[PDB]
Design a protein around this nucleic acid. Sequence first.
RNA 1: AGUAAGGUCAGCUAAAUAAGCUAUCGGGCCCAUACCCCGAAAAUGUUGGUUAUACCCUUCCCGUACUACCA
RNA 2: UCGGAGUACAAAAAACCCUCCGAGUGAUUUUAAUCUAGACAAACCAGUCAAAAUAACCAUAACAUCACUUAUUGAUCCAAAAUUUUGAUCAACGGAACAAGUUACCCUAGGGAUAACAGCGCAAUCCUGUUCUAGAGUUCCUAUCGACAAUAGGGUUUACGACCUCGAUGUUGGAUCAGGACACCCAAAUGGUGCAACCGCUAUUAAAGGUUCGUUUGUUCAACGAUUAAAGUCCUACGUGAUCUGAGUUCAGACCGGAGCAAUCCAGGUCGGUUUCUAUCUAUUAUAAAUUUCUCCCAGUACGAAAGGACAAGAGAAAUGGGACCAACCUCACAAACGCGUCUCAGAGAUAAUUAAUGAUUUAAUCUUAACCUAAUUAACUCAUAAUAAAUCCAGCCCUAGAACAGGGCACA
RNA 3: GUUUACCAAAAACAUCACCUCUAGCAUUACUAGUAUUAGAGGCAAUGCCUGCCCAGUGACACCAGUUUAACGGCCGCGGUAUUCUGACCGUGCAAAGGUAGCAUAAUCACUUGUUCUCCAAAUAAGGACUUGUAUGAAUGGCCACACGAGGGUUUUACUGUCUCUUACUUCCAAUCAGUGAAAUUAACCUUCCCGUGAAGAGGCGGGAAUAAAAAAAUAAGACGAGAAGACCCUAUGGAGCUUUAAUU
RNA 4: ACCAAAGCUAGCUCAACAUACUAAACAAAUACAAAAAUACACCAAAAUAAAAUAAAACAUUCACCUAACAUUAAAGUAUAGGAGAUAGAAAUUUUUAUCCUGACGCUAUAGAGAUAGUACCGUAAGGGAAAGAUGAAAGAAUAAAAUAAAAGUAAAAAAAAGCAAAGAUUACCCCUUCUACCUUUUGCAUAAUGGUUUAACCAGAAAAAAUCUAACAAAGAGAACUUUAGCUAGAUACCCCGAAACCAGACGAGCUACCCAUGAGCAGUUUAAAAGAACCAACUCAUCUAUGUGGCAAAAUAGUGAGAAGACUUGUAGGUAGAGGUGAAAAGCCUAACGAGCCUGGUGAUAGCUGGUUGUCCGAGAAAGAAUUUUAGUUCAACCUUAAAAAUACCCCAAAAACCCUAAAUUCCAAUGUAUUUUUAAGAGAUAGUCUAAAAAGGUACAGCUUUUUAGAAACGGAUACAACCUUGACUAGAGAGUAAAAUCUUAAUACUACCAUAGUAGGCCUAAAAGCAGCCAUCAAUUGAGAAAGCGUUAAAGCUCAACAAAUUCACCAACAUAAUCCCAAAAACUAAUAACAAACUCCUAGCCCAAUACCGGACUAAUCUAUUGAAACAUAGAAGCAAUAAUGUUAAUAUGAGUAACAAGAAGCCUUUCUC
Lengths: 29, 112
Amino acid sequence: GSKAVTRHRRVMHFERQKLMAVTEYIPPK
Amino acid sequence: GSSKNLGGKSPGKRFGIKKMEGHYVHAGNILATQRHFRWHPGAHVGLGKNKCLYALEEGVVRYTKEVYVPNPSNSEAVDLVTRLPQGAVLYKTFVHVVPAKPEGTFKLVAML
RNA sequence: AGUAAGGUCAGCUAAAUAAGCUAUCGGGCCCAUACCCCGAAAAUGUUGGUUAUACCCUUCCCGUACUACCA
RNA sequence: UCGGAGUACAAAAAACCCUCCGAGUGAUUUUAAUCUAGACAAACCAGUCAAAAUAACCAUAACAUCACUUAUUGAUCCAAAAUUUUGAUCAACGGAACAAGUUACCCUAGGGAUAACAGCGCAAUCCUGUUCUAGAGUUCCUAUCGACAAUAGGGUUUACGACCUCGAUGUUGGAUCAGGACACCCAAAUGGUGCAACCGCUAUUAAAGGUUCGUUUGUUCAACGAUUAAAGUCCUACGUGAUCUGAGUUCAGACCGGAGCAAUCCAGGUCGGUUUCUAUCUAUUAUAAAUUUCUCCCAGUACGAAAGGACAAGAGAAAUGGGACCAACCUCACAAACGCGUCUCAGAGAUAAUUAAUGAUUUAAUCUUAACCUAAUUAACUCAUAAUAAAUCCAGCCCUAGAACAGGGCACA
RNA sequence: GUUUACCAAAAACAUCACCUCUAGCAUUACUAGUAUUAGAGGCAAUGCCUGCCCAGUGACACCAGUUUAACGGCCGCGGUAUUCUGACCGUGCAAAGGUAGCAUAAUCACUUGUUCUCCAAAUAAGGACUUGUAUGAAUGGCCACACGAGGGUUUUACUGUCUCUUACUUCCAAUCAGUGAAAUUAACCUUCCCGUGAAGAGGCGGGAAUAAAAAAAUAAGACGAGAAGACCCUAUGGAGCUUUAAUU
RNA sequence: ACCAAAGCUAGCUCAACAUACUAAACAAAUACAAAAAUACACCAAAAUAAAAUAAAACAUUCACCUAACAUUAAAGUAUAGGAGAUAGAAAUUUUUAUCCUGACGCUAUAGAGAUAGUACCGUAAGGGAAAGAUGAAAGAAUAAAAUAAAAGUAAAAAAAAGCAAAGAUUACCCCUUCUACCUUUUGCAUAAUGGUUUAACCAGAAAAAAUCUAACAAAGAGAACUUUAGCUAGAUACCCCGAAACCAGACGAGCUACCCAUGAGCAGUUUAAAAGAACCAACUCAUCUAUGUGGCAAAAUAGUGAGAAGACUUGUAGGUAGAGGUGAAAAGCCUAACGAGCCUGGUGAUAGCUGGUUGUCCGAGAAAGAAUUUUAGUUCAACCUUAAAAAUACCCCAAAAACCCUAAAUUCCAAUGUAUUUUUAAGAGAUAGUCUAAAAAGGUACAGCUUUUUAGAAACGGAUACAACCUUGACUAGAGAGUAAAAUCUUAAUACUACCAUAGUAGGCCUAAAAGCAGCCAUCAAUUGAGAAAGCGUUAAAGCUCAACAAAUUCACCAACAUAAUCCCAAAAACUAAUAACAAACUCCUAGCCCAAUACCGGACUAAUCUAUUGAAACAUAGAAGCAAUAAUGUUAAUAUGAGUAACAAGAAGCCUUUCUC
Ligand SMILES: *C(=O)[C@H](CCSC)NC=O
Ligand SMILES: [K+]
Ligand SMILES: [K+]
Ligand SMILES: [K+]
Ligand SMILES: [K+]
Ligand SMILES: [K+]
Ligand SMILES: [K+]
Ligand SMILES: [K+]
Ligand SMILES: [K+]
Ligand SMILES: [K+]
Ligand SMILES: [K+]
Ligand SMILES: [K+]
Ligand SMILES: [K+]
Ligand SMILES: [K+]
Ligand SMILES: [K+]
Ligand SMILES: [K+]
Ligand SMILES: [K+]
Ligand SMILES: [K+]
Ligand SMILES: [K+]
Ligand SMILES: [K+]
Ligand SMILES: [Mg+2]
Ligand SMILES: [Mg+2]
Ligand SMILES: [Mg+2]
Ligand SMILES: [Mg+2]
Ligand SMILES: [Mg+2]
Ligand SMILES: [Mg+2]
Ligand SMILES: [Mg+2]
Ligand SMILES: [Mg+2]
Ligand SMILES: [Mg+2]
Ligand SMILES: [Mg+2]
Ligand SMILES: [Mg+2]
Ligand SMILES: [Mg+2]
Ligand SMILES: [Mg+2]
Ligand SMILES: [Mg+2]
Ligand SMILES: [Mg+2]
Ligand SMILES: [Mg+2]
Ligand SMILES: [Mg+2]
Ligand SMILES: [Mg+2]
Ligand SMILES: [Mg+2]
Ligand SMILES: [Mg+2]
Ligand SMILES: [Mg+2]
Ligand SMILES: [Mg+2]
Ligand SMILES: [Mg+2]
Ligand SMILES: [Mg+2]
Ligand SMILES: [Mg+2]
Ligand SMILES: [Mg+2]
Ligand SMILES: [Mg+2]
Ligand SMILES: [Mg+2]
Ligand SMILES: [Mg+2]
Ligand SMILES: [Mg+2]
Ligand SMILES: [Mg+2]
Ligand SMILES: [Mg+2]
Ligand SMILES: [Mg+2]
Ligand SMILES: [Mg+2]
Ligand SMILES: [Mg+2]
Ligand SMILES: [Mg+2]
Ligand SMILES: [Mg+2]
Ligand SMILES: [Mg+2]
Ligand SMILES: [Mg+2]
Ligand SMILES: [Mg+2]
Ligand SMILES: [Mg+2]
Ligand SMILES: [Mg+2]
Ligand SMILES: [Mg+2]
Ligand SMILES: [Mg+2]
Ligand SMILES: [Mg+2]
Ligand SMILES: [Mg+2]
Ligand SMILES: [Mg+2]
Ligand SMILES: [Mg+2]
Ligand SMILES: [Mg+2]
Ligand SMILES: [Mg+2]
Ligand SMILES: [Mg+2]
Ligand SMILES: [Mg+2]
Ligand SMILES: [Mg+2]
Ligand SMILES: [Mg+2]
Ligand SMILES: [Mg+2]
Ligand SMILES: [Mg+2]
Ligand SMILES: [Mg+2]
Ligand SMILES: [Mg+2]
Ligand SMILES: [Mg+2]
Ligand SMILES: [Mg+2]
Ligand SMILES: [Mg+2]
Ligand SMILES: [Mg+2]
Ligand SMILES: [Mg+2]
Ligand SMILES: [Mg+2]
Ligand SMILES: [Mg+2]
Ligand SMILES: [Mg+2]
Ligand SMILES: [Mg+2]
Ligand SMILES: [Mg+2]
Ligand SMILES: [Mg+2]
Ligand SMILES: [Mg+2]
Ligand SMILES: [Mg+2]
Ligand SMILES: [Mg+2]
Ligand SMILES: [Mg+2]
Ligand SMILES: [Mg+2]
Ligand SMILES: [Mg+2]
Ligand SMILES: [Mg+2]
Ligand SMILES: [Mg+2]
Ligand SMILES: [Mg+2]
Ligand SMILES: [Mg+2]
Ligand SMILES: [Mg+2]
Ligand SMILES: [Mg+2]
Ligand SMILES: [Mg+2]
Ligand SMILES: [Mg+2]
Ligand SMILES: [Mg+2]
Ligand SMILES: [Mg+2]
Ligand SMILES: [Mg+2]
Ligand SMILES: [Mg+2]
Ligand SMILES: [Mg+2]
Ligand SMILES: [Mg+2]
Ligand SMILES: [Mg+2]
Ligand SMILES: [Mg+2]
Ligand SMILES: [Mg+2]
Ligand SMILES: [Mg+2]
Ligand SMILES: [Mg+2]
Ligand SMILES: [Mg+2]
Ligand SMILES: [Mg+2]
Ligand SMILES: [Mg+2]
Ligand SMILES: [Mg+2]
Ligand SMILES: [Mg+2]
Ligand SMILES: [Mg+2]
Ligand SMILES: [Mg+2]
Ligand SMILES: [Mg+2]
Ligand SMILES: [Mg+2]
Ligand SMILES: [Mg+2]
Ligand SMILES: [Mg+2]
Ligand SMILES: [Mg+2]
Ligand SMILES: [Mg+2]
Ligand SMILES: [Mg+2]
Ligand SMILES: [Mg+2]
Ligand SMILES: [Mg+2]
Ligand SMILES: [Mg+2]
Ligand SMILES: [Mg+2]
Ligand SMILES: [Mg+2]
Ligand SMILES: [Mg+2]
Ligand SMILES: [Mg+2]
Ligand SMILES: [Mg+2]
Ligand SMILES: [Mg+2]
Ligand SMILES: [Mg+2]
Ligand SMILES: [Mg+2]
Ligand SMILES: [Mg+2]
Ligand SMILES: [Mg+2]
Ligand SMILES: [Mg+2]
Ligand SMILES: [Mg+2]
Ligand SMILES: [Mg+2]
Ligand SMILES: [Mg+2]
Ligand SMILES: [Mg+2]
Ligand SMILES: [Mg+2]
Ligand SMILES: [Mg+2]
Ligand SMILES: [Mg+2]
Ligand SMILES: [Mg+2]
Ligand SMILES: [Mg+2]
Ligand SMILES: [Mg+2]
Ligand SMILES: [Mg+2]
Ligand SMILES: [Mg+2]
Ligand SMILES: [Mg+2]
């Protein structure tokens, strides 16, 4: 395992990726 | 290279608080053990040579914040009080044991 | 790399009672120099801590020394 | 081994050959008793506190103190002392009453739980490209380079990890055969230049073919002699030992220098030293349609002050490679085989970088991930074309056909 | 001459020579002998030589002491003749401070030292230079004749070693007849590629290829077959050797 | 249909009784070199057993281990022990004779090794087997009866595709779905281990404390003891194979090392030479290379080599024996393995190390804290299993827990929700851990890296494959149904083009020269309009361009980044209506026998043997054990595969045994 802070854009857990994709910003239309 | 730090291994002494508020304790039970003065003894609470707090009477353990008036013979403590400004008073935490059982009762032993 | 280990007068040694020899400086002896005789000066590598210092420890620096093996 | 602080942020506990401080006792007198409720802590052994009660002394008196106060320490047995009490750098500190070296002459039981060779992970080291311009370049950032720094990727080196194998994954270099990548050494096309020409420097595109012979060293590497269009970088178990080699590493023998009192040891050298296998399975056992150099010529022309000195186009001769053949020469004591000898070797399409025409978004211009048409243009590659071609005589004999099986002849011979 | 019978035949051991050491002597060795003798060893003919050191250890004397052809040892720091070098000088420690000789050697590393000759080209070979701070004098130094199935280099002559292979015979080989073995083998109806995976797939995943059998060949893979890895570590598992380990 | 299969005797084991214990045979020959009638002799002998092991090492010690005279008790007591391991008496007690003896012992891989210590392997001590089946009669072999059932073959070779099978199907394949089995590990289809296949044989054993059942009970027991509900009896228990070694006693010098006896060889050639001289054979060694590598050979053949009158080869026979012999030291040789021979005995040596451990089904089910010549192991604690008792366990609000700053959050506790928890009595396993998320440390803010704390997981579904990620309360049957995780991810972007320039003035200063354009200073001013200058340029000037005139009016910040080695990698698709659909070990539906698992522990049944009674076309209730084999490079025997493959041999003709070729 890697440290908390790295240099290579640490890959997120797959469950967290879904969280980052469902909480996106939708500008008003 | 080579290690320069030595002797860093030592088990903990389990210093901490034993009886929380509301626990029913008997005489002789150790309320808490400490390294420095973290909780000062209060009413019905003794103080051993190793700064441990043990209850003197059977009852309920209570914790309280009170004022601190040091012993005049303690030169270091009285000096700290002397330098305090006029509007301030020291506050310390104390451990109390409110007695539950009465001292005794009167019973009829003989009716002559 | 690691470990070991030392620095003291200008120089080399022994003690920490900082001494001894030599060099250096002044004078005497000789025609002059040297030898020789007389007198004086001279230092504890470095920083900090060692009741206080020194022989100690620590820091800095120079330099010395051993080992670096089985596939 | 024992204590304190951080890692362990707020009850406890909590690790590393983790980061920093210490202890293996002194000073002093207040010389600190006996007996018992109840608890903290803890695997155990150990460690800690403690009311009441009794005695001591103000005649209803128990915390020895200070130095971060926390650590200042050792179990049985056994031994000595009065019976009270004492005894270990037993420090390997839960402590065997008392015991070192070497083994490459080694043996046995096991481990991929654990190293060397190989793969894999990772990218410190290494390699390749880009971003940023201070400057070097007489002036001029980027013709050629570019410090202090930014960013992406390759997996060749030495390391790091110890994940698959120690009831075996045989280990350097050569010999044979080479498969592949392009970050291209040569061959082809092109942009830029501090490119006149010649010789160069640099960048883009292209992997079908090619990349020499020798002296020394076991050598890969490197130096040197001669040459070539060029003598590329790297992967493939740093390809390839059921194909070969064993000079070197890497057993047993033996000297020299050194270390050790010795036995023996040295990524220090030197001489010598067994390289096994009858192929079960998988895989595999021939189509062709060339490439480069040199000469002559263009031409002492183009280009230049001169000195120097071209490209394209044309013609010719060789070499390597592919595939064939004996009239001669040569090997040749078979009527054949064989090289040193002889013979042959090709058209069309198609492209990458790049160059040019027409022209709109933008009524200019502009090669166009704008349309239509069209031009100059690397190598691959594809194809024209060439080879193969008759179903069903076959006992026997012959054969320039052949392991067997097949194949060609056997009417005039 | 001798040795590791069965991976080393050598530079190892032995050897004539030289030297050290221990013994004054009788019925089974030495020896039917008596110091010109006989044992316990070292080093290796010959020739020139074998330097200095009894402090330590050992031996002898068993007391002082004596012995290195007994085990072993045989030095720093600083200054000094224009410069370089260091005859010399100061000072210290030792039982003495490496003397003669030879030398980039079979001699740690530096190392492919430097230079000359040999070659078109020399990490080789020979001859010199030489601190070799780790050469060195019977654990022997140095020189030479002869000798060597030892190790290295050169010239000449030869040759398929090689540029570069070819022809022809015999034993194998292939067909026919006879006899007929071995290692090996979980079951196999036993493909290729990329990816995945105990980190190198005939078997998994995504795709490709695909009538079934026989005989003869080449050795890339089946982490091929063979030996419960010789390397390395572990085991309160062994053994051989040595001594300043412990006990005796 | 072959190969094969079946049988029940031979005899054996353990006792008892018992004479009292080297049999049978000894005509002749037997310790000369045994089995050879016959000549002056010598003859004989003893010295404590040691060690493998246990103490987890090993030095004092270690039962039995040569010689005891027994049994019931005293007693595992007194004592003896690195006072550790373990070793262990006595005083004093008990014991009635003879017959009733046979078998819950085996039946040819069993039982003795035995048909036999014979074949056979070793010089010797020693080691040491396999092997039998007809019937009343084989004086019934044109002979007869019986299973025709192991692996291996034949009858009957094979037809795309795959752990060889399942779901099936009218149909063998074709289709769909599945990474062999044990052992060992954090994790194995692994290219980690073992097995060709078949039959036979081969591995859990003990009763102190305890639980279950029963007798009798303040007492129990058929003496000796235990007793504040105990005593007596029964039942429930703890494996196999393997080292290198160590000690004692025997047998080996016919090979080899050396020696003592007794013999025998060296021709020719060259030299005054029989000189450890020279050339070269016999003879003896074995340098180099190639064949050979289960070979002709457990060290050879072919070529080539060294010595060859000596420190030489060689025959016969004798001597030295393992704490040793021997050695021109190679740690050589002493009967094909010598850092110390072989054989037997001690020996079932001992291994924390490797391998193996045999019927069905069911219940619950553990990843490591502390010491340790200890980290390859053990003994405690935690956790867990079986049985039992008891009352509180988890969740847990307010209050409460430090002083300079400090997050997620813990400790403690009523309600409530829910049945868990503690204690007592018996216990083993485990104590070698992997990843993901989170807080840290070492490292390169590297590793599928390493050290701790909190939490999770180890699907037969999904992420194409996949131990660790996500969905999931693991029963059986059905040709029913609803759902969960989840299947192709984004952008791949940047045109900026008119027209037009004249004054003071080379501004001062500066410099060799500084004319908007090294620097310093100032930065005013003509013209409607234009900076003592924004850029380029010049040695300095000149010159070009940009700001300002006018003309005129789409929009214009920013967003560009190379490549790897056997062959690219599902095929393909921009719109017919989507909080769709299809999709599990989840959950409903119909019936039930009503919920997974490795080490350890608990329970219920059961195949095949013998015995006690039943049973009498093969069983029932009980009591007993040599009580079950897909796995130990397992043992013996038999079969295959490799394979009809590797490899082996006889000169020719004829008138047959005579002539020819070598
Ligand atoms: C390295 O030398 C080792 C062998 C040691 S014993 C010759 N290599 C093994 O593969
Ligand atoms: K210890
Ligand atoms: K790394
Ligand atoms: K291995
Ligand atoms: K190429
Ligand atoms: K195969
Ligand atoms: K020829
Ligand atoms: K444009
Ligand atoms: K020889
Ligand atoms: K002496
Ligand atoms: K030389
Ligand atoms: K020789
Ligand atoms: K092969
Ligand atoms: K293996
Ligand atoms: K194993
Ligand atoms: K197994
Ligand atoms: K004999
Ligand atoms: K033979
Ligand atoms: K162990
Ligand atoms: K100017
Ligand atoms: Mg993590
Ligand atoms: Mg700790
Ligand atoms: Mg701490
Ligand atoms: Mg507690
Ligand atoms: Mg009191
Ligand atoms: Mg003890
Ligand atoms: Mg300890
Ligand atoms: Mg402790
Ligand atoms: Mg003990
Ligand atoms: Mg050796
Ligand atoms: Mg072994
Ligand atoms: Mg491990
Ligand atoms: Mg390899
Ligand atoms: Mg490696
Ligand atoms: Mg591998
Ligand atoms: Mg990378
Ligand atoms: Mg510049
Ligand atoms: Mg980077
Ligand atoms: Mg590993
Ligand atoms: Mg194997
Ligand atoms: Mg090669
Ligand atoms: Mg190639
Ligand atoms: Mg390119
Ligand atoms: Mg080119
Ligand atoms: Mg290789
Ligand atoms: Mg090789
Ligand atoms: Mg070979
Ligand atoms: Mg190979
Ligand atoms: Mg060699
Ligand atoms: Mg030597
Ligand atoms: Mg040789
Ligand atoms: Mg060699
Ligand atoms: Mg074949
Ligand atoms: Mg072959
Ligand atoms: Mg031309
Ligand atoms: Mg236009
Ligand atoms: Mg064609
Ligand atoms: Mg024909
Ligand atoms: Mg000789
Ligand atoms: Mg030999
Ligand atoms: Mg030899
Ligand atoms: Mg002499
Ligand atoms: Mg000599
Ligand atoms: Mg010699
Ligand atoms: Mg010598
Ligand atoms: Mg001498
Ligand atoms: Mg003396
Ligand atoms: Mg010389
Ligand atoms: Mg010499
Ligand atoms: Mg050298
Ligand atoms: Mg050489
Ligand atoms: Mg040569
Ligand atoms: Mg020389
Ligand atoms: Mg020397
Ligand atoms: Mg000597
Ligand atoms: Mg010497
Ligand atoms: Mg001579
Ligand atoms: Mg010679
Ligand atoms: Mg020549
Ligand atoms: Mg045949
Ligand atoms: Mg097939
Ligand atoms: Mg693969
Ligand atoms: Mg597949
Ligand atoms: Mg597939
Ligand atoms: Mg064949
Ligand atoms: Mg074949
Ligand atoms: Mg396989
Ligand atoms: Mg291989
Ligand atoms: Mg193998
Ligand atoms: Mg093994
Ligand atoms: Mg070894
Ligand atoms: Mg241990
Ligand atoms: Mg041992
Ligand atoms: Mg032992
Ligand atoms: Mg012994
Ligand atoms: Mg001693
Ligand atoms: Mg023991
Ligand atoms: Mg044991
Ligand atoms: Mg005994
Ligand atoms: Mg005693
Ligand atoms: Mg039998
Ligand atoms: Mg049987
Ligand atoms: Mg059969
Ligand atoms: Mg199928
Ligand atoms: Mg798997
Ligand atoms: Mg493993
Ligand atoms: Mg386990
Ligand atoms: Mg396997
Ligand atoms: Mg294994
Ligand atoms: Mg096998
Ligand atoms: Mg009992
Ligand atoms: Mg012993
Ligand atoms: Mg013995
Ligand atoms: Mg003999
Ligand atoms: Mg003769
Ligand atoms: Mg001779
Ligand atoms: Mg011999
Ligand atoms: Mg021969
Ligand atoms: Mg030969
Ligand atoms: Mg020949
Ligand atoms: Mg000869
Ligand atoms: Mg000779
Ligand atoms: Mg004898
Ligand atoms: Mg001996
Ligand atoms: Mg001899
Ligand atoms: Mg030797
Ligand atoms: Mg040796
Ligand atoms: Mg033998
Ligand atoms: Mg055993
Ligand atoms: Mg552990
Ligand atoms: Mg336990
Ligand atoms: Mg609360
Ligand atoms: Mg509660
Ligand atoms: Mg463990
Ligand atoms: Mg772990
Ligand atoms: Mg890890
Ligand atoms: Mg690990
Ligand atoms: Mg956990
Ligand atoms: Mg799946
Ligand atoms: Mg369910
Ligand atoms: Mg303008
Ligand atoms: Mg590029
Ligand atoms: Mg595809
Ligand atoms: Mg469904
Ligand atoms: Mg269960
Ligand atoms: Mg496990
Ligand atoms: Mg029964
Ligand atoms: Mg059984
Ligand atoms: Mg069986
Ligand atoms: Mg095997
Ligand atoms: Mg078996
Ligand atoms: Mg049989
Ligand atoms: Mg066969
Ligand atoms: Mg074959
Ligand atoms: Mg044959």
